[PDB]
Ligand binder design. Structure first.
Ligand SMILES: [Cl-]
Ligand SMILES: [Cl-]
Ligand SMILES: [Mg+2]
Ligand SMILES: [Mg+2]
Ligand SMILES: [Mg+2]
Ligand SMILES: [Mg+2]
Ligand SMILES: [Mg+2]
Ligand SMILES: [Mg+2]
Ligand SMILES: [Mg+2]
Ligand SMILES: [Mg+2]
Ligand SMILES: [Mg+2]
Ligand SMILES: [Mg+2]
Ligand SMILES: [Mg+2]
Ligand SMILES: [Mg+2]
Ligand SMILES: [Mg+2]
Ligand SMILES: [Mg+2]
Ligand SMILES: [Mg+2]
Ligand SMILES: [Mg+2]
Ligand SMILES: [Mg+2]
Ligand SMILES: [Mg+2]
Ligand SMILES: [Mg+2]
Ligand SMILES: [Mg+2]
Ligand SMILES: [Mg+2]
Ligand SMILES: [Mg+2]
Ligand SMILES: [Mg+2]
Lengths: 185, 56, 48, 171, 159
RNA sequence: GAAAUUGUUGAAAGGGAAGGGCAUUUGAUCAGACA
RNA sequence: GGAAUACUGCCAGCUGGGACUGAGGACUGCGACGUAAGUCAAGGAUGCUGGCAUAAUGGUUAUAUGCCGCCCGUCUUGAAA
RNA sequence: AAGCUCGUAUCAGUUUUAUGAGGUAAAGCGAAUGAUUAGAGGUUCCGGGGUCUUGACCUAUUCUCAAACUUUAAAUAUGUAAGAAGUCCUUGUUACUUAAUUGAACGUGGACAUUUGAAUGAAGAGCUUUUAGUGGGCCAUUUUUGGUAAGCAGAACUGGCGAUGCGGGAUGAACCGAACGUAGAGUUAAGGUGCCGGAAUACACGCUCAUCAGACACCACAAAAGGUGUUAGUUCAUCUAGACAGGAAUGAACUAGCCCUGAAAAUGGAUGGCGCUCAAGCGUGUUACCUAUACUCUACCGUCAGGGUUGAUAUGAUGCCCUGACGAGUAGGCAGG
RNA sequence: GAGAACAGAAAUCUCCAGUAGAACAAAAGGGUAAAAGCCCCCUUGAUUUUGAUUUUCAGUGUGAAUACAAACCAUGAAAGU
C-alpha cells in the first residue's frame, strides 16, 4: 500500500497533436516537431503548441491589428507570425510594407498586403527563412471577445449576459431587475 | 416516519478534496467603499501627475 | 540539498523479526515505536 | 527482561539566576539504558519540580555486582498498587546478585498478587549482613548447619516417541 | 423555536473586564490609523455603535478606509471550501494596533545594519533566523556539588 | 431439422444433494519440432 | 597489583553448504590486474556431457485425493435469508 | 471529461518563532449572587413568653454545593506576520486636509539580490467551461443530551462500513493486521505452535484441586456479603526473666491473590471440537518457530510521465526505442475494441 | 443608621454611610454614575436623494443593523452630537 499524495495515472491535460485530420496540417506539425527537438529555440516550441489549438483558441487577426503592432518602436522590419487566419479590415486606410506568415489568408487580406508591397508566406516558407525565428513577431487575436464568453459566470451582482432567445420589453426586465418590482439583482 | 435532522459528518473531507484556497492577492485592489471625498480628489491628483510626466 | 536528493529508502521487514510479540506499543513499554536511540542501528541493518 | 542496575545522575538546566544546579542520583533496575533514563524522570517528577524538558541527564553508568559468586540474603522493601488501594511490603530473597534478586521479586509479585511491572516501586534493596536478622521462615530454613535434602521422584526426558521399558524415578 | 439573533451567545464575550468598567481612556482616541495598517478586532461592550459581529472577535485584518470616527477593515472569512473577503466598518474603540508585525519591522532594520557593517570586510552575513539547536558538550564539576541519592517513598495516608 | 425433453448402446462415478476454484496422480485422447 | 573472560559495537577479514532467477542481444560506459602487449567476476550465462526423439514432456477431458467454495437477480444502513 | 495560460514561479488538513482572541476542564465560597450544617461573642424606646428563654439581624469562625453562579483559569482547537507588491534617501501632483509645503494618497530618480530574511515538503502552478450520480445512511473510540435501561432516540471531532476482497477474532458489513495487475523467491503483521492444524508435549519463577474449576480485547454477563480452603502481606501484644495446648514460638485485629459459597428455566450441547490438572489453566519473563493479495528483489501485461530518433537504398514518425513511477472499487463519467 | 408636634414598622424635614445592592415600556443577557438614571429648557434628524457594508446566506430575497457622500435642519458658549 502507498499513501498517495496526488491522483494516479493522470493525463497531462494538454494537447500533443491536432484534433484535425488535415493531411497538410500534419505535415507542418512534423516539420516543427523536428525543429523544436534540434534547435533549442523558444520560438519553435511556441509555434508547435499553437498548431494544436482548436478554432476558438485561434481567433482571427486582422490587418489593422498587424499594422498597429508594426508601429512599436523598433518593430517596423520584423516578420509578423500568425498561427491562424488573417482577415481584412477596411477601417484602416494605410498599410505598411511588411511580410506576414500565416496559416490562412482571406481573399481581401491577401490583396491588401500585396498591393502595399508586402508578401504573404506559409509557415514552411517561414521555417526556411528563419529556422530559429529570427526577427519574428507573434500576434494573437482576442479570445474573450467571443459571444459565448459573455454568458459565463452568470449570477447575482455579476453583470453577465443572460442566456435568452428573444430580447425586448417583456423579456427578463421585470421583478429581479428593478426596485419597483420586488428588488434589483 | 422520522429521519435524521442534521450532521456535519464527512463535510470537512469534502471541503479538502479541492478546497481551502487562499484568496488571490492583487496589486491595485478595488476601491469599493472608499470615502467618496477622498476618491474625488484622488482622481484629480492622478490627472495632474499624468500631464507632468507626459509633458516632461 | 544532499538529503532531499536521496530518494526515500525502501527497506524490507527485519530478517530476524522485530524481537517483540506486539509492535504497536512504545519501545519503553516493550513495543516497537518511538525513540530507541542507538538501538535503531541493529533494527535498520536487519531491515537492510 | 534480564535486569541491569544503572546509576543515573541528572540536574536542572542551568540559568543565569542559578548556575550549577544540584546533582541528583538514583539506582534504577532496567533491561537497557533507554528504559533506565525514562524511569529516572518518572521518579524525579515525584520528588522535585522538574521534568525532562526542563533538565538534562549528566551521566548513566552500569553498576556491576561486587562479588557475583557469593550467596547473599537480601531484604527488599516495595510499594505496589492493588486493584483497590496502595500497600507497602517487605520481602526477603536469597540470590548471588542484586539484579538476580530483583528479577525474582518481580516474578513473585506477579505470581502471588497479580501486580504488573507498572504497579511496583522498588523502595530499597539491602543485603542482610548477619544471621538472626532474617525474619522470614522460608528463607531461614536454608541457613541451618549442614543442610542436606534429596530430590525424590526424578522424571527423565525422552527424545523418542516410544520407549521399550517401564521407566524408573529413582535418584 | 431556535434563536439566532445578531448578538446571540455573546453573554461573556462582550462583558467588560473585572474592575475595568466605565469610560474608555483617551489613548484609544489619540491613535492614528492609516490604510495598510494591521489591526486586530476586540469589541468593547460599553460602545454599542460601530460594534463588530461576534465572528470577527479575535480576528486580524488590514485597514482599507479611514473615516471620521471609524476605519474600514478587510477580513478573509472561510465559507464552504474557499475564502471570501469581508469589509467591516468599525469604530476605533473596538480595534487596536497589532504587534504581530511591529516586532517584524525591527528585524528588517537590524538586517540592514548588520549587512552594512559586514559589507566592507565580511562575507556570509547570515541574516536568517534558525530554530533552537541541540546543546553542545559540557563538563559538570562535582566540586561542592556531590550528587545526592534519592529513593522512592512509601505510601502514606496523612488524611 | 437446433434446444428443452426421451430411448438404446458405450465409458465413468455415487455411505443424508449435485455443481465450482487451485494443484497433482490415474485412464482416455491429441497437436507441434524432428534439418 | 597484573591479566583473562563475559556483554555491546566495528572490519573497504577469510571461508563452507542450500534455494530461486538468466531479463538483454555487434561495438560504445565506469573500473580492476598489468613495464608492455593484453586479460578480467567491469553497462543481465556461459562451458562441458548424457538419455530420448515419442505420447516421454506437455495440452485437453473424465475421475480420485488435500484444502477451500451458501442462489442468482433486485430494493436496502444491512440478503444464503 | 474537455482542455487553456505558464514552467517552479508559489503553495501546504504540518512544525517553529513573534504577537492576538476564548471562559470549557479544573478551581473558589473565613471573594460577589444563590443554596447550606453547627456553635460562639455582641445588639432593642423596634418580635414574643416570662422578669428572663426562644427568634431576628451584627461581628469573628465552621461543614457542604451550582447546566441556565463567579475573582482566577488550562490542555486540545483557532486569527495574523516571517520582505522585491520590501526597506531607505531626495522631491513631483491635487479641487482633499492643515494656522502653515502641514498631512494624506499616488508617482519621478538614486541605493540595497536570491543564508532575499525560520523548518519540512512540493508525479508542477494558476485558471475556465460543461455535465453524471447523490440529497433514506449506518458503525467504532473519545466528548455529550433525553430516558431505569435498550442491538433506544438525538448531536460534536476523527476513522471506517456502505462501495472491499485478503490474513486473524471457530462463526459475523463495521474489531485487529493490511488494502488487490499476472507470477517466482525471501521476510513479516495481527494471531498462533498437545491433536484436529502449518509451528517448541520449549525454557524459567510462582499460584490454583472446583460432588457445576478455568482458559485471551470488541464478545456473547454476574453483584453485595462471607470461608482457621490455601498463599503472601500490614499493625499490635506475649515469649531467652519457659508463653500458647494438655520446651519453641504463639495470640489478636486487618489487607488482597487464586479457589469455594452466594449462583433457579424450559429439544440435547458446546473455552470452536477432542481433551487437558508441577496443564494443553492463571500471572509474568526469555528465545526459537509457523504464515497475508502487506514489505524487499526479479520477470511479464497495461496505464501515466519525462526523453531519444526523417538521411537515403525496405514497408507502419498515429512508427521504432530509452528511462522512472504506478495498478482496490458500487452509483456514475470517459476511452480503446 | 442617627434625629424633628400630632406621626405609629411605612406621610414630611435634616445629616451621615452608601461600586449601584436602584433605575433604564417589555423576556432574558450585556451596558451605563459630574450617566445611558432623575429633574428642567429648547426642539422634530422618526427629514431629502441614491449607492457601499454586516448578520441569516446560495454569499439570492426579506427583516434588522453599521460607516460615509451630497443637501436641508435641531441643539449647545463650543468641541461636538
Ligand atoms: Cl453520517
Ligand atoms: Cl477434494
Ligand atoms: Mg435526509
Ligand atoms: Mg527464519
Ligand atoms: Mg506479533
Ligand atoms: Mg440605535
Ligand atoms: Mg425433414
Ligand atoms: Mg437434445
Ligand atoms: Mg504429464
Ligand atoms: Mg476436489
Ligand atoms: Mg477433502
Ligand atoms: Mg467450507
Ligand atoms: Mg428495512
Ligand atoms: Mg441477494
Ligand atoms: Mg458558555
Ligand atoms: Mg466543574
Ligand atoms: Mg430517495
Ligand atoms: Mg432508528
Ligand atoms: Mg445503497
Ligand atoms: Mg469468538
Ligand atoms: Mg503440526
Ligand atoms: Mg504462561
Ligand atoms: Mg505479498
Ligand atoms: Mg496496488
Ligand atoms: Mg481499477
Amino acid at each position: 500500500g502507498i499513501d498517495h499524495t496526488s491522483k494516479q495515472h493522470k493525463r497531462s491535460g494538454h494537447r500533443t497533436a491536432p484534433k484535425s485530420d488535415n493531411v497538410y496540417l500534419k505535415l507542418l506539425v512534423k516539420l516543427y516537431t523536428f525543429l523544436a527537438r534540434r534547435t533549442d529555440a523558444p520560438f519553435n516550441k511556441v509555434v508547435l503548441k499553437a498548431l494544436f489549438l482548436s478554432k476558438i483558441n485561434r481567433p482571427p487577426v486582422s490587418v489593422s491589428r498587424i499594422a498597429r503592432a508594426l508601429k512599436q518602436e523598433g518593430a517596423a522590419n520584423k516578420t509578423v507570425v500568425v498561427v491562424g487566419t488573417v482577415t481584412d479590415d477596411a477601417r484602416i486606410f494605410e498599410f505598411p510594407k511588411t511580410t506576414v506568415a500565416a496559416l490562412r489568408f482571406t481573399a481581401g487580406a491577401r490583396a491588401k498586403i500585396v498591393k502595399a508591397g508586402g508578401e504573404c508566406i506559409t509557415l514552411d516558407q517561414l521555417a526556411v527563412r528563419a529556422p530559429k525565428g529570427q526577427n519574428t513577431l507573434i500576434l494573437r487575436g482576442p479570445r474573450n471577445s467571443r459571444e459565448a464568453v459573455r454568458h459565463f459566470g452568470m449570477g447575482p451582482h455579476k453583470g453577465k449576459a443572460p442566456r435568452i432567445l428573444s430580447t425586448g420589453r417583456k423579456f427578463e426586465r421585470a421583478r429581479g431587475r428593478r426596485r419597483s418590482k420586488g428588488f434589483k439583482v | 416516519a422520522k429521519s435524521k435532522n442534521h450532521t456535519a459528518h464527512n463535510q470537512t473531507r469534502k471541503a479538502h478534496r479541492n478546497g481551502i484556497k487562499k484568496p488571490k492577492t492583487y496589486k491595485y485592489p478595488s476601491l469599493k467603499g472608499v470615502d467618496p471625498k477622498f476618491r474625488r480628489n484622488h482622481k484629480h491628483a492622478l490627472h495632474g501627475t499624468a500631464k507632468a510626466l507626459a509633458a516632461a | 540539498q544532499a538529503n532531499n536528493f536521496l530518494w526515500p529508502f525502501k527497506l524490507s521487514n527485519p530478517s530476524g523479526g522485530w524481537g517483540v510479540p506486539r509492535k504497536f506499543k512504545h519501545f519503553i513499554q516493550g513495543g516497537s515505536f518511538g525513540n530507541r536511540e542507538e538501538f535503531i542501528n541493529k533494527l535498520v541493518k536487519s531491515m537492510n | 527482561a534480564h535486569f541491569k542496575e544503572y546509576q543515573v545522575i541528572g540536574r536542572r538546566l542551568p540559568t543565569e539566576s542559578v548556575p550549577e544546579p544540584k546533582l541528583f542520583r538514583m539506582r534504577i533496575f532496567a533491561s537497557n539504558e533507554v528504559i533506565a533514563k525514562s524511569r529516572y524522570w518518572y521518579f524525579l517528577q515525584k520528588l522535585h519540580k522538574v521534568k525532562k524538558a526542563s533538565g538534562e541527564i549528566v551521566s548513566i553508568n552500569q553498576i556491576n555486582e561486587a562479588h557475583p559468586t557469593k550467596v547473599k540474603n537480601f531484604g527488599v522493601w516495595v510499594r505496589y498498587d492493588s486493584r483497590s488501594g496502595t500497600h507497602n511490603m517487605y520481602k526477603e530473597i536469597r540470590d548471588v546478585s542484586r539484579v538476580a534478586a530483583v528479577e525474582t521479586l518481580y516474578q513473585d509479585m506477579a505470581a502471588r498478587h497479580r501486580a504488573r511491572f507498572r504497579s511496583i516501586h522498588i523502595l530499597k534493596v539491602a543485603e542482610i549482613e548477619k544471621t538472626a536478622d532474617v525474619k522470614r521462615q522460608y528463607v531461614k530454613q536454608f541457613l541451618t548447619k549442614d543442610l542436606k535434602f534429596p530430590l525424590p521422584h526424578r522424571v527423565q526426558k525422552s527424545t523418542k516417541t516410544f520407549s521399550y521399558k517401564r521407566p524408573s524415578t529413582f535418584y | 423555536g431556535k434563536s439566532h439573533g445578531y448578538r446571540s451567545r455573546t453573554r461573556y464575550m462582550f462583558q467588560r473586564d473585572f474592575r475595568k468598567h466605565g469610560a474608555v481612556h483617551l489613548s484609544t482616541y489619540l491613535k492614528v490609523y492609516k490604510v495598510g495598517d494591521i489591526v486586530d478586532i476586540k469589541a468593547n461592550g460599553s460602545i454599542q455603535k460601530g460594534m463588530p459581529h461576534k465572528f470577527y472577535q479575535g480576528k486580524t485584518g488590514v485597514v482599507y478606509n479611514v473615516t471620521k470616527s471609524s476605519v474600514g477593515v478587510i477580513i478573509n472569512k472561510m465559507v464552504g471550501n474557499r475564502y471570501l473577503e469581508k469589509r467591516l466598518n468599525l469604530r476605533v474603540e473596538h480595534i487596536k494596533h497589532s504587534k504581530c508585525r511591529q516586532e517584524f519591522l525591527e528585524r528588517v532594520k537590524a538586517n540592514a545594519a548588520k549587512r552594512a557593517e559586514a559589507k566592507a570586510q565580511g562575507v556570509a552575513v547570515q541574516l536568517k533566523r534558525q530554530p533552537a539547536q541541540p546543546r553542545e558538550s559540557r563538563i559538570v564539576s562535582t566540586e561542592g556539588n556531590v550528587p545526592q541519592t534519592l529513593a522512592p517513598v512509601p505510601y502514606e495516608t496523612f488524611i
